[PDB]
């Protein structure tokens, strides 16, 4: 029989809640905000602390040094749009509500604040309705270069700029749409393909390797590592790519290169029929 899946955007209420002293209370605070959030609510505006803003400022400042030579053209295209409309600055952390409103005008995507990791099924189910579950907290100040879990920096600098791109927006949703009510095996295959594209993908533009992986675009160290030449590279092929192990708390052992977003989209459409 078919497992439960959302049939409308508001149904995501039923799946979004899955799962240093001052930092812990701060983290619980953000978790509480996401937990009590219901569809239709404005995403609660948060006054970030200076340490959090300085952390964002450090990551943001350093990544912007790398983006022109590392990021794909679409990322570099939409990133200034975010700084002109959503307050992307070194001294200011953008609000999830504002960028969500921006995405609505651009690609119809929206943001939903989430406490932490959701199951791949629940997360991909959100994409089916062009909803991206975002963490609202900032990474610990100890290591701004890399963090073993998503933070608001990862969402805002990694995911948001490409979600504003129609071709990429379509690609993301179709992965989500494919996931709806799919078998456990199918969801995991889709989740792995999502992982090595949306989160850690590489693309070929004008003969050059560029980064569109969100997990890469928000990590100072791995972004450099991905294009250094010391990394393992393979062509994106869903049947093969979906068999690759997804690593956490570390750099990936291999990266997959797509020809383009529409190319990645077409390869996925072919693949989802097989499963």
Ligand X SMILES: Cc1ccn(-c2cc(Cl)ccc2[C@@H](Oc2cc(-c3ccc(C[C@H](N)C(=O)O)cc3)nc(N)n2)C(F)(F)F)n1
Residue positions forming the annotated binding site: 117, 139, 147, 154, 159, 199, 218, 248
User: Quick one: which of 177, 246, 257, 275 contacts ligand X (CB under 6 A)?
Assistant: 246
DSSP 36-90: T--TTSPPPP----HHHHHHHHHHHHHHHHHHHHHB-HHHHHHHHHHHHHS--BT
- Nearer of residues 146 and 236 to ligand X, judged by Cβ: 146
Considering only residues 94-123, where is the footprint of ligand X by CB under 6 A?
117, 119-120
User: CB under 8 Å, gap of 24 or more: what pairs does 178-181 form?
Assistant: 178/268, 178/272, 179/120, 179/121, 179/124, 179/125, 179/127, 179/128, 180/5, 180/6, 180/125, 180/128, 181/2, 181/3, 181/5
- Nearer of residues 93 and 214 to Fe ion, judged by Cβ: 214
Considering only residues 34-73, where is the footprint of ligand X by CB under 6 A?
none
User: Quick one: which of 59, 175, 214, 220 contacts Fe ion (CB under 5 A)?
Assistant: 214
- Least separation in angstroms between residue 71's CB and ligand X is 14
Residue 149 interacts with which of ligand X, Fe ion, none, CB < 5 to 8 Å by class: ligand X
Whether 199 is catalytic is yes
- Least separation in angstroms between residue 115's CB and ligand X is 12
- Nearer of residues 174 and 199 to Fe ion, judged by Cβ: 199
Report DSSP state, residue 116.
S
146 binds ligand X (CB under 6 A): yes
147 binds ligand X (CB under 6 A): yes
Checking the chain for breaks where C and the next N are over 2.5 Å apart, the residues before them are: 19
132 binds ligand X (CB under 6 A): no
DSSP 183-232: -HHHHHHHHHHHIIIIIT-EEEETTEEEE--HHHHT-HHHHHHHTTS-S-
Whether 154 is catalytic is yes
Catalytic residue among 74, 199, 222, 258: 199
- Nearer of residues 55 and 218 to ligand X, judged by Cβ: 218
- The three-state secondary structure class of 233 is strand
Report DSSP state, residue 155.
I
Whether 218 is catalytic is yes
- Nearer of residues 124 and 203 to ligand X, judged by Cβ: 124
**If you search the block for the tokens 């791995």, which residue do you land on?**
222
163 binds Fe ion (CB under 5 A): no
Region near ligand X per CB under 6 A, out of 9-17, 45-53, 165-173, 246-254: 246-254
Backbone dihedral angles phi then psi of residue 221, each to the nearest 5 degrees? -75, -50
Catalytic residue among 70, 133, 154, 174: 154
Residue 22 interacts with which of ligand X, Fe ion, none, CB < 5 to 8 Å by class: none
Q: What are 72's two structure tokens?
A: 């794909």
Taking only Cα atoms into account, the Rg of the chain, rounded to an integer number of angstroms, comes to: 18
- Least separation in angstroms between residue 134's CB and Fe ion is 9
Catalytic residue among 218, 219, 222, 258: 218
Binding site for ligand X (CB under 6 A): 117, 119-120, 146-147, 149-150, 154, 188, 191-192, 195, 199, 215, 218-219, 246-248
Residue ranges that bind Fe ion, judged by CB under 5 A: 214
């Amino acid at each position: 029989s078919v497992p439960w899946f959302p049939k409308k955007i508001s149904d995501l209420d039923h799946c979004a809640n899955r799962v240093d002293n001052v930092y812990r209370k701060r983290r619980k605070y953000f978790a509480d905000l996401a937990m009590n959030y219901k569809h239709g609510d404005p995403i609660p505006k948060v006054e970030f602390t200076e340490e959090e803003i300085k952390t964002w400022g450090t990551v943001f400042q350093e990544l912007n040094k790398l983006y022109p030579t590392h990021a794909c053209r679409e990322y570099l295209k939409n990133l200034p749009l975010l700084s002109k409309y959503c307050g992307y600055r070194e001294d200011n952390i953008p609000q999830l509500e504002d960028v969500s409103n921006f995405l609505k005008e651009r690609t119809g995507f929206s943001i939903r604040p989430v406490a932490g990791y959701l199951s791949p099924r629940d997360f991909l189910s959100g994409l089916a309705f062009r909803v991206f579950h975002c963490t609202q907290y900032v990474r610990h100040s100890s290591d701004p270069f890399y963090t073993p879990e998503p933070d608001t920096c990862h969402e805002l600098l990694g995911h948001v700029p490409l979600l504003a791109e129609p071709s990429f927006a379509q690609f993301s949703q179709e992965i989500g749409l494919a996931s709806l009510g799919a078998s456990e095996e199918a969801v995991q295959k889709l989740a792995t393909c999502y992982f090595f594209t949306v989160e850690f993908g590489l693309c070929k533009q004008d003969g050059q390797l560029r980064v569109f992986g969100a997990g890469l675009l928000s990590s100072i160290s791995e972004l450099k590592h991905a294009l250094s030449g010391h990394a393992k590279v393979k062509p994106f092929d869903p049947k093969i790519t979906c068999k690759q192990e997804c690593l956490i708390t570390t750099f990936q052992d291999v990266y997959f290169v797509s020809e383009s977003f529409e190319d990645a989209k077409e390869k996925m459409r072919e693949f989802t029929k097989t499963i």
